[PDB]
Design a protein around this ligand. Structure first.
Ligand code: CHL
Ligand code: CHL
Ligand code: CLA
Ligand code: CLA
Ligand code: CLA
Ligand code: CLA
Ligand code: CLA
Ligand SMILES: CCCCCCCCCCCCCCCC(=O)OC[C@H](COP(=O)(O)OC[C@@H](O)CO)OC(=O)CCCCCCCCCCCCCCC
Ligand SMILES: CCCCCCCCCCCCCCCC(=O)OC[C@H](COP(=O)(O)OC[C@@H](O)CO)OC(=O)CCCCCCCCCCCCCCC
Ligand SMILES: CC(/C=C/C=C(C)/C=C/[C@@]12O[C@]1(C)C[C@@H](O)CC2(C)C)=C\C=C\C=C(C)\C=C\C=C(C)\C=C\[C@@]12O[C@]1(C)C[C@@H](O)CC2(C)C
Ligand SMILES: CC1=C(/C=C/C(C)=C/C=C/C(C)=C/C=C/C=C(C)/C=C/C=C(C)/C=C/C2=C(C)CCCC2(C)C)C(C)(C)CCC1
Lengths: 742, 95, 227, 163, 89, 81
């Protein structure tokens, strides 16, 4: 059943189609008549399933394109490593991590760009970076530029290998359709190899390289005097000097005396006091345990050898008296349509990225990362934005599947049909939830504003006035803080210092982590988050469920996935397509993520980050004003945007001037998007008619007829420039402020 | 809905066909006690007429609101209490 | 909301009776086909295969049950009253039968002006004779009514008229048999508790409520070993 | 495996709606049928009296515990007056709705068919006179309920956990 | 709509109670003992409800665990019956 | 070490798992379990010399599960006792 099936030389390698711009489409291949052709060409390029109708070619194209993206990522990684090997102060930073600002980008002297080369320290001039690569390299045990250069060369070699593999598997030996549909074998191989073996290999690297080097670095040994990584493998005496249990070899492993390895495979919470990061011995036991768990999990599904579970039978077995046929029919959908798989994977990847952001600020895994405030803020905001984008894409491509690949014949009385049959109730109840949340949270904010303006602060929803405490979150914090005594007795400390119990970790006169109190303002802000998230879900789910039909337009599935309207009739049918629902969900996702990152920035600056002096007295960056000033909209406007933007607007003439320039440019681009968002196509078409007359009067009219952008293109351009402007504004603001005060 | 078979359309039963049912309507005539009904029909029956109810509601609301507004004690309303501190001078000495 | 018009369908009489072993009851005696109150299909001894024997056992069970119900309430009330505060000659049930041997006699609620009986043989003979007479009236008719059913005569014995509606009648019959079987079980419990511990039910419950692990029936496990 | 709970509304697949445990259930159906709103054979005045009593009684608490005068010595009176004013405003709303909806000649609009196909007399609530009587009853009952709640809370002590 | 939509068994209650009390009671000073003790240790219950337990109490964790286990056992028991007779395996 | 308790536990776990594999007391390549855990017969194109149908795949699977169970038991007993 499961076997390798390929075709020899399916597509001939030639440059002939490179001279046919629209070869992939049967309508675009005829050439252009209007300027719409160019946009259609660049818009339909990578939409493979609209060109052909057979799954084999689509699957082969997807495989090769994924090879290409892998090659691009390898080029990017090689570039980062090389630019850190040649244009950085990584060694000087290694000597003095707490005073040297990381820097890996250097600008040329041309038009006054000199001012951007700041005094980051270590006898170096360059742009301060916030990607956190220095901390990752230090945790990996890298102590020289030669190792980084070797890694860059290896990355380039891997990029070449990925390019060759993509060419090979498209133009020379293309797998057949039966090869791609081996989902059981794919899950077995990926889940066991890619995850378990990769985690086991990283655990091996940590145990054999990173533990001794970082142990010596934390002790105080100068980086130039530390022996090279292979000297701990060729001479086990050194590694036994650092961790004495290595002197026993692998005998405790095979005799099940695993407690002998307890000095480098620990289970201890908290952070390293010297570096303010997680202990690397815990990271060793945990990448090892993850490897074991994934390797066990990967031997589950049935393949050529009889044993194992079959996913089709499992899906067909779980059904009950409330859901008719249950999960029947999903296997064919998920082995027949790429779009359903894309939707599921995008949703999971976005949620996982958001989880990564939370867990990474709460438990800083790298040395000297917690006390580098700019890196923490940058990483959190970046991966949060990425997760939001991915979760919106999930809904987009799920709606694409519903419009194109849905087949009512296969889905008679399963979960999909019954979901499509009670959609009005779902949307109605979710509408009520959105309205209820919006009122009882934002109205609380407006009530606070009005009470404060009227001179009645005793009638507000504040800690000193009427209180709204988050009792459930407080109880969860207290429970998690007392785990190392009752429910996880083998732990030394709690999972993170953010729980109520614990102490303060300070590295170089700066607070790394600290217990985070939760009060009325935190109650308000999490319920704001809940409001925005349920509203975004409402928009996207309404788009997905009503993608095929409604009461307004019974035959919406005939018009396609991406169409502007169905005319001015029935009162007006603008934006009835699932594409426009994604178009609005993008705006609401932007709103939600902006509120989330603002909450994170203000709360951290006000209650966690700060400078500590003798006698253990803590002074925070904004002096704990979040609890009192964040309960009002005026409080936000005055004490966050007005107060914290002083750095970006005063950065002219310093090394931070680029941040102010991009601050202004982003406000500009965001404003510029409104002219595409607020207007329509007919006005611009008529104006273009007049301009075309002007060009015609001088015999210089173009052969390709100019046309106004289509309706869908107008919406897409508006939303793209809008998102770019807003996100770049926040980027410049955050980076300027946190580089100045961090 | 004739209901004999999968037929759900019947011109004879158009209320069944259009689904014009009373989901929870209950027509049991005995709910309350006789003397309760006597008392309530005697007293609450005055407001049955609707135009008179409108006039009474408007006049009573206006009278109540005016009386409460014009006779509220200073210790309850701050606007009637008035200022109690010395006034603050303006920026350029303008009062 | 619909009009159900379900007239008479009682789950305690048909072929789908709950039965005493639940799912494990399986095969049930042929003669125990239901049709009588409290028919859980438990005749593993085969002592009611003859219909006459079955009827005699039914009547005897019902009368033992009623006697046990009365005895249970009578054994439990005076102790709770003493807990409330009313003074009695003997609180426990298994010692109050010898209060008339005390020269102070027997007193209702401890009040000397009530009963205060000192005579013994006369009152025992009187109660024996009158109760034998009422037993005869039960068996072979009498002034308060004519015997209709051996177990359920009725007539003047339901002055409140709750035995009118047959469905509520059957529900009341099964409720009576269930509470009576519980009462007989509690009588066996009271007798055994009097035998083994020599203490009244109220302090037995207090002891079980005080360190239940230490204070239970297992504390008297070794008190009867021979030798 | 063929047993299913969810069913089309009254067995007609082509009428918008489902018949679920939430919608149809002996406890839920009995409770909804025994509420005064669905007692179609009872005079609208008494139904309005009960509804007004319940609503006026429930309204007193929120206005007294939370309000501008909640920390003063006249909190109960202020809250009771606010609840009575809200009852008056809702009575005005009911009156104008009844005027705008029903005329003196229309027979009735309530469905006259039960779920089981039985034919019954349509409710007199959906009429001009019926709505007028219901509104008068609601006004009187709401005022009575507000007064009763005020009396219980403050005229007599009657200690309460929050009061 | 079937009146007995939740096909009435009413013996699943006893089986669920037994099958949740047997595992919970097993460990030392763990399980239903805590819930029973806190049910007894109400406080100044001589008249009515003593003010609710504070956040810093084990009562919340113990009660949550106990009722979650009981509900899981009851649901799995109800699915065990009525699903064995309808087929499904 | 050969007579040690850990060695005995590991060899017993592996032997019992292999015994339950070869004789129809556990699922294997040629004997599929249903939703009711019934062990119906399944035909695989794997040739073995064992007349009962026990293959090398079954040997590897049963040995792996036995090593897993034995390690778990040994660690649990060491932690408790
Ligand atoms: C599924 C397990 C289950 C088991 C093991 C039992 C076991 C028993 N039930 Mg039963 N029941 C069970 C389920 C149920 N019972 C009952 C309702 C009753 C009743 C009313 C009675 C029993 C009695 C009995 C006992 C009869 C045999 C005996 O005296 O044993 C001796 C050895 C030990 C026996 C202990 C009888 C009893 O308690 O007599 C002492 C009795 O009157 N059961 C219901 C509700 C319908 C069940 C629901 O699942
Ligand atoms: C004439 C006076 C007379 C009196 C005072 C009583 C009073 C009594 N009868 Mg009764 N009976 C009497 C005549 C008769 N009885 C009965 C048939 C029964 C029965 C079957 C039962 C009683 C029981 C009882 C006792 C329980 C009281 C009760 O039913 O509640 C009570 C001593 C019940 C009993 O003895 O339980 C302890 C009981 O089961 N009587 C018949 C035959 C029709 C009588 C004929 O005249
Ligand atoms: C790995 C993730 C992934 C993958 C493989 C795809 C793949 C695809 N997307 Mg998708 N998308 C994703 C993530 C992804 N998307 C996310 C996160 C979002 C949220 C913003 C979207 C939103 C989105 C929209 C709105 C549309 C697509 C469309 C498409 C198809 C053609 C895209 C194109 O023509 O490029 C052209 C590239 C450009 C024009 C560059 C602009 C910058 C293709 C199947 C289109 C489609 O499916 O048409 C039927 C389409 O309309 N995508
Ligand atoms: C029917 C049982 C019952 C009753 C009458 C009350 C009654 C009360 N509770 Mg209580 N409570 C109960 C069960 C009960 N509780 C249970 C099972 C839990 C768990 C709580 C948890 C709880 C908390 C956490 C609080 C109350 C409070 C209160 C008081 C304000 C209402 C009131 C006296 C509040 C109070 O006044 O203190 C309060 O803060 N209760
Ligand atoms: C938490 C307790 C618990 C658990 C785990 C199970 C588990 C199981 N029971 Mg079960 N059962 C329970 C309590 C429980 N039961 C109780 C209390 C009763 C008495 C009413 C029953 C009565 C019962 C019967 C009569 C039958 C089962 C059956 C089953 C098996 C398949 C059906 C099922 O529910 O899948 C359970 C699903 C999983 C184990 C997968 C979940 C993984 C996460 C499964 C092993 C059937 C065999 C069968 O015929 N059970
Ligand atoms: C105690 C349990 C047990 C276990 C784990 C095995 C396991 C095995 N037996 Mg086996 N066997 C057993 C009992 C067992 N047997 C008994 C009781 C008998 C007597 C009837 C046999 C008779 C037997 C024969 C005759 C042969 C095997 C063979 C095999 C091997 C097949 C490998 C393969 O796929 O060849 C491909 C495998 C290791 C075959 C083999 O290749 O052995 C080396 C083989 O020819 N067995
Ligand atoms: C003789 C049988 C036996 C015994 C006594 C134990 C005993 C124990 N096992 Mg264990 N185990 C066994 C068989 C046994 N196991 C088997 C057969 C396997 C399958 C390979 C496992 C797999 C296993 C894992 C994967 C883990 C344990 C853990 C534990 C410890 C309990 C932690 C716990 O429950 O927290 C309560 C946990 C929650 C309430 C959640 C405890 C010492 C844990 C441990 O070592 O922690 C230190 C742990 O992570 N066991
Ligand atoms: C280094 C990594 C790889 C880079 C690309 C390598 C491409 C190798 C050849 C691919 C095509 C293979 C099939 C040949 C056949 C093919 O493509 O079509 C076949 C076609 C035949 O044309 P003719 O006129 O010779 O024959 C027509 C017939 O009808 C009668 O003979 O064209 C050729 O033979 C040209 C082949 C080279 C075409 C590309 C030339 C330029 C390539 C390099 C561009 C960059 C140069 C940079 C210099 C610094
Ligand atoms: C709570 C509701 C609950 O118990 O859900 C769980 C319930 C489970 O139904 P079944 O046991 O019939 O499901 C069997 C299989 O479909 C499970 O995969 O499903 C529904 O009620 C449908 C979704 C209702 C969603 C309501 C919101
Ligand atoms: C069987 C049993 C309980 C069974 C309960 C069942 C089936 C419940 C079933 C149900 O839940 C279902 C399924 C479904 C629900 O819808 C309905 C019910 C009906 C609720 C308890 C036995 C319990 C048995 C007990 C406790 C026995 C104790 C014996 C002791 C202590 C003896 C002590 C001495 O004999 C010594 C040792 C020697 C001398 O000293 C003398 C003394 C002192 C007499
Ligand atoms: C031929 C022959 C035979 C047999 C013999 C024998 C002796 C057998 C045995 C066999 C065996 C005896 C096998 C075994 C196997 C085992 C295995 C296969 C294992 C594995 C393991 C594993 C897989 C583990 C893993 C792991 C874990 C899970 C834990 C942690 C660590 C690690 C990772 C390592 C017969 C009788 C038939 C006949 C005669 C001859």
């Amino acid at each position: 059943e499961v076997k390798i099936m390929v075709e020899k030389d399916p597509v001939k390698t030639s440059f002939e189609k490179w001279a046919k711009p629209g070869h992939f489409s049967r309508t675009l291949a005829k050439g252009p008549n209007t300027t719409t052709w160019i946009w259609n060409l660049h818009a339909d390029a990578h939409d493979f399933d609209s060109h052909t109708n057979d799954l084999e070619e689509i699957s082969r194209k997807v495989f090769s394109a994924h090879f290409g993206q892998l090659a691009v990522i390898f080029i990017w990684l090689s570039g980062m490593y090389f630019h850190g090997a040649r244009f950085s102060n990584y060694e000087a930073w290694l000597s003095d991590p707490t005073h040297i600002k990381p820097s890996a980008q250097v600008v040329w002297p041309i038009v006054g760009q000199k001012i951007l080369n700041g005094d980051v320290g270590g006898g170096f001039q360059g742009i301060q970076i916030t990607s956190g690569f220095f901390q990752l390299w230090r945790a990996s045990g890298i102590t020289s530029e030669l190792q980084l250069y070797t890694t860059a060369i290896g990355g380039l070699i891997f990029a070449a290998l990925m390019l060759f593999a993509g060419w090979f598997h498209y133009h020379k030996a293309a797998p057949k359709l039966a090869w791609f549909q081996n989902v059981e074998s794919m899950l077995n191989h990926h889940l066991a190899g890619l995850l378990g073996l990769g985690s086991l290999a990283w655990a091996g690297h940590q145990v054999h390289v990173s533990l001794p080097i970082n142990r010596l670095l934390d002790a105080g040994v100068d980086p130039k005097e530390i022996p090279l990584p292979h000297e701990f493998i060729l001479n086990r005496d050194l590694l036994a000097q650092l961790y004495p249990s290595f002197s026993k070899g692998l005998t405790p492993f095979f005799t099940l005396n695993w407690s002998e390895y307890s000095d480098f495979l620990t289970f201890r919470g908290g952070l390293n006091p010297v570096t303010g990061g997680l202990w690397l011995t815990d990271t060793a036991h945990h990448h090892l345990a993850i490897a074991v768990l994934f390797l066990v999990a990967g031997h589950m599904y049935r393949t050529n050898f009889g044993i194992g579970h079959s996913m089709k039978e499992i899906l067909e077995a779980h059904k009950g008296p409330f859901t008719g046929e249950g999960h029947k029919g999903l296997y064919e959908i998920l082995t027949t349509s790429w779009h359903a798989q894309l939707a599921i994977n995008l949703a999971m990847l976005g949620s996982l990225t958001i989880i990564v952001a939370h867990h990474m600020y709460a438990m800083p895994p790298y040395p000297y990362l917690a006390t580098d405030y700019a890196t923490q803020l940058s990483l959190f905001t970046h991966h949060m934005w990425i997760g939001g984008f991915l979760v919106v894409g999930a809904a987009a491509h799920a709606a694409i599947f519903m419009v194109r690949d849905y087949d009512p014949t296969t889905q008679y009385n399963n979960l999909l049909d019954r979901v499509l049959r009670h959609r009005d109730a779902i949307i109605s109840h979710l509408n009520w939830v959105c309205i209820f949340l919006g009122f009882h949270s934002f109205g609380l904010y407006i009530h606070n504003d009005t009470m404060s303006a009227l001179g009645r602060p005793q009638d507000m929803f504040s800690d000193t006035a009427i209180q709204l405490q988050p009792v459930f979150a407080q109880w969860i914090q207290n429970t998690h803080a007392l785990a190392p005594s009752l429910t996880a007795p083998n732990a030394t400390a709690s999972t993170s210092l953010t729980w109520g119990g614990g102490d303060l970790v300070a590295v170089g006169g700066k607070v790394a982590l600290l217990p985070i109190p939760l009060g009325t303002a935190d109650f308000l802000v999490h319920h704001i988050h809940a409001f925005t998230i349920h509203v975004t879900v409402l928009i996207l789910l309404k788009g997905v469920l009503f993608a095929r039909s409604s009461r307004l337009i019974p035959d919406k599935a005939n018009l396609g996935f991406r169409f502007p309207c169905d005319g001015p009739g029935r009162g007006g049918t603008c934006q009835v397509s699932a594409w426009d629902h994604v178009f609005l969900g993008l705006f609401w996702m932007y709103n939600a993520i902006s509120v989330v990152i603002f909450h994170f920035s203000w709360k951290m600056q006000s209650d966690v980050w700060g400078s500590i002096s003798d006698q253990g007295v803590v002074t925070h960056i904004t002096g704990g004003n979040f609890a009192q000033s964040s309960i009002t909209i005026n409080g936000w406007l005055r004490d966050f945007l007005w107060a914290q933007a002083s750095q970006v607007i005063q950065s002219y003439g310093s090394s931070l001037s680029a941040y102010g320039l991009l601050f202004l440019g982003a406000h500009f681009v965001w404003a510029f998007s409104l002219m595409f968002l607020f207007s329509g196509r007919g006005y611009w078409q008529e104006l273009i008619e007049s301009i075309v007359w002007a060009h015609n009067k001088l015999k210089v009219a173009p052969a390709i007829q100019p046309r106004a952008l289509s309706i869908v293109q107008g919406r897409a351009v508006g939303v793209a420039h809008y998102l770019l402007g807003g996100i770049a504004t926040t980027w410049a603001f955050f980076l300027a402020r946190i580089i100045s005060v961090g | 809905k004739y209901g004999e078979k999968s037929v759900y359309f019947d011109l004879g039963e158009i209320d069944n066909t259009t689904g014009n049912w009373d989901l929870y309507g209950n027509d049991d005539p005995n709910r309350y006690n006789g003397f309760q009904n006597k008392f309530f029909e005697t007293f609450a029956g005055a407001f049955t007429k609707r135009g008179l109810l409108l006039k009474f509601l408007v006049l009573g609301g206006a009278t109540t609101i005016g009386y409460l507004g014009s006779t509220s004690s200073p210790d309850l309303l701050a606007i009637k209490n008035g200022p109690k501190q010395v006034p603050v001078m303006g920026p350029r000495g303008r009062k | 909301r619909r009009t159900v018009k379900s007239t008479s369908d009682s789950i305690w009489y048909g072929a789908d009776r709950p039965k005493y072993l639940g799912p494990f009851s399986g095969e049930t005696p042929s003669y125990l086909t239901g049709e009588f109150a409290g028919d859980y299909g438990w005749d593993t001894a085969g002592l009611s295969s003859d219909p006459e024997t079955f009827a005699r056992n039914r009547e005897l069970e019902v009368i033992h049950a009623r006697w046990a119900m009365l005895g249970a309430l009578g054994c439990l009330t005076p102790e709770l009253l003493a807990k409330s505060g009313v003074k009695f000659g003997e609180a426990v049930w298994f010692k109050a039968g010898a209060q008339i041997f005390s020269e102070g006699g027997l007193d209702y609620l401890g009040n000397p002006s009530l009963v205060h009986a000192q005579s013994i043989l006369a009152i025992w003979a009187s109660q024996v004779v009158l109760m034998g007479a009422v037993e005869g009236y039960r068996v072979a008719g009498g002034p308060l009514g004519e015997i209709t059913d051996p177990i359920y005569p009725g007539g003047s014995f339901d002055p409140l008229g709750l035995a009118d509606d047959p469905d509520t009648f059957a529900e009341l019959k099964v409720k009576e048999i269930k509470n009576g079987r519980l009462a007989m079980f509690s009588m066996f419990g009271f007798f055994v508790q009097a035998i083994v511990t020599g203490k009244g039910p109220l302090e037995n419950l207090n002891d079980h409520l005080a360190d239940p692990v230490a204070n239970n029936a297992w504390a008297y496990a070794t008190n009867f070993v021979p030798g | 495996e063929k047993y299913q709970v969810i069913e089309p509304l009254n067995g007609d697949p082509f009428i918008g709606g489902f018949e679920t445990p939430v919608t149809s259930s002996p406890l839920i159906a009995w409770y909804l049928s025994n509420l005064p709103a669905y007692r179609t054979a009872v005079a609208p005045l008494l139904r309005g009296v009960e509804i007004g009593l319940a609503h006026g009684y429930l309204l007193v608490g929120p206005f007294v515990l939370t309000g501008p005068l909640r920390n003063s010595a006249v909190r109960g009176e202020a809250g009771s007056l606010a609840a009575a004013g809200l009852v008056t405003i809702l009575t005005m709303c009911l009156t104008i709705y009844g005027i705008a909806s029903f005329k003196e000649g229309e027979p009735s609009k309530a469905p006259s068919l039960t779920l089981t196909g039985r034919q019954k007399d349509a409710d007199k609530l959906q009429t001009a006179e019926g709505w007028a009587s219901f509104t008068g009853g609601w006004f009187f009952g709401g005022l009575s309920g507000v007064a009763w709640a005020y009396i219980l809370l403050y005229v007599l002590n009657l200690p309460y956990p929050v009061k | 709509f079937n009146r007995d939509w939740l096909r009435k068994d009413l013996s699943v209650i006893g089986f669920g109670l037994i099958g949740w009390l047997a595992p919970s009671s097993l460990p030392v000073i763990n399980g239903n003992s805590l819930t029973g003790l806190f049910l007894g240790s109400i406080g100044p219950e001589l008249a009515h409800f003593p003010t609710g337990p504070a956040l810093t109490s084990p009562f919340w964790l113990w009660m949550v665990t106990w009722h979650v286990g009981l509900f899981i056992v009851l649901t799995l028991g109800q699915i065990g019956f009525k699903g064995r007779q309808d087929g499904y395996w | 070490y050969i007579g040690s308790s850990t060695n005995l536990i590991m060899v017993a776990s592996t032997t019992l798992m292999l015994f339950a594999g070869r004789f129809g007391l556990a699922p294997s390549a040629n004997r599929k379990s249903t939703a009711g855990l019934k062990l119906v017969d399944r035909d695989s194109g794997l040739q073995t010399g064992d007349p009962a149908g026990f293959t090398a795949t079954d040997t590897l699977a049963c040995g792996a599960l036995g090593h897993v169970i034995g390690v778990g038991i040994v660690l649990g007993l060491k932690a408790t006792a």
